[PDB]
């Protein structure tokens, strides 16, 4: 429960069963992750502008209750794991106390088309957010 | 000169009304357009590879009948307009003789900076378009 | 009334050319439209729940300049035309006063599972905010 | 068991020039719908009978990217089957190279509540499990 990102469900994101399609959640996770990084003073667009990337190597999502058009969801994200070459975010998607789904995204760090260590200045800033 | 691209509707593409969301149609037109260029011997991934791009500058769609999950749609595409700087594609989205939607897409050419359509590419496109 | 919807571009919405894919704009116009209906005292989820629908019969977009990840865009929406059985919305997608795209969406009104006239109460409400 | 060939769409590519990780779930869904089709269970027909296979969990591991211009193949099999749940495992490949692997876990919904997979449907599935 470090940062919270509010997301208003979009009509286009609902499926035939009348709920947010399960593939949409990864996008919600990305939005929250991006917001987290920005709030930490590491706006992601500026990171990639330096030739630094945090590509997703693994995704995991458990859907407990659905989100629907007309609702607003809150995505809580924190940096659960941080190493010199990788990061792991964990998320909780809820609506007014009710957990809707929970998941995580494992990332590697890419600098100039190659897996590498997270540059110092970015590592330093992220470290403050990671509990050692 | 018209080409047909068949697309099986994906579950993810339908909305609450139980039909293919209207925003998805543009993606259908894209796959059809890419299919059209590929058949013409102009695989778009290769066109961009050489630094040439056909950005969309105008989109238009009229929805007559919905498409539903479990169906296969057919997209007929043809190059309606061609110039040394722009292109206009028109389409018909149908399902077994029924017209679901019609529209178009106008494009410009970039090499990012605007530019005329490169010769070799223009010659090919030209064979697909007639005044 | 003119609603203004601030949209933060998502990484998932940008394509290979490093810009927001043209197909995404329709989703933007839809979100802005929803906002507009909300401010019009007609939250769409509640309208739909009533069995009333506003399906899109026509869409039109002109793209003048790209939007990119890291940017926030504003979509100004106006109810351009209103008839007993239809409505036409017009939009402007801008970034810092710079017009990136403009378009419209034409809708019909479906009651239950049939194309019909816009319910009086909803029509009246729309005939005052514009 | 099942093999679904999918042509990467331009709209599916991201700034890094590869297919966005969120698209993969959509690929798994088409491959899954295909697998059901091949088992004599066209999904649209299933839902029409008031039977659904909502996703309760998803997992994906990305080894190599997919790019526009390429065609990928999703191999899917029914790894787990019970009277109330299903577990599909997938492999996304290109020219024999593994791009990603994952799974989707499902519950069965008849009408509006979790329920046992109907007899005929379970039967057709157990044969492929």
UniProtKB/TrEMBL annotation, chain A:
Family: Belongs to the 4-hydroxybenzoyl-CoA thioesterase family.
Top-level taxon of the source organism: Bacteria
Organism: Thermus thermophilus (strain ATCC 27634 / DSM 579 / HB8)
Record-given protein name: Probable thioesterase
Keywords: Hydrolase
Molecular-function annotations in GO: fatty acyl-CoA hydrolase activity
């Amino acid at each position: 429960m470090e940062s919270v990102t509010r997301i208003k469900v979009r009509y286009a994101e609902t499926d035939q069963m009348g709920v947010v399609h399960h593939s949409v959640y990864a996008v919600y996770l990305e939005a929250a992750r991006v917001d987290f990084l920005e709030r930490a003073g590491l706006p992601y667009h500026r990171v990639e502008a330096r030739g630094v990337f945090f590509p997703v190597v693994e995704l995991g999502l458990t859907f407990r209750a659905p989100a629907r058009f007309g609702e607003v969801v809150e995505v809580r994200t924190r940096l659960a794991e941080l190493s010199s070459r990788a990061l792991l975010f964990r998320y909780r998607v809820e609506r007014e106390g009710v957990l809707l789904a929970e998941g995580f995204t494992r990332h590697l760090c890419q600098v100039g088309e190659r897996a590498a260590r997270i540059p110092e200045d970015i590592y330093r800033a992220l470290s403050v957010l990671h509990l050692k």
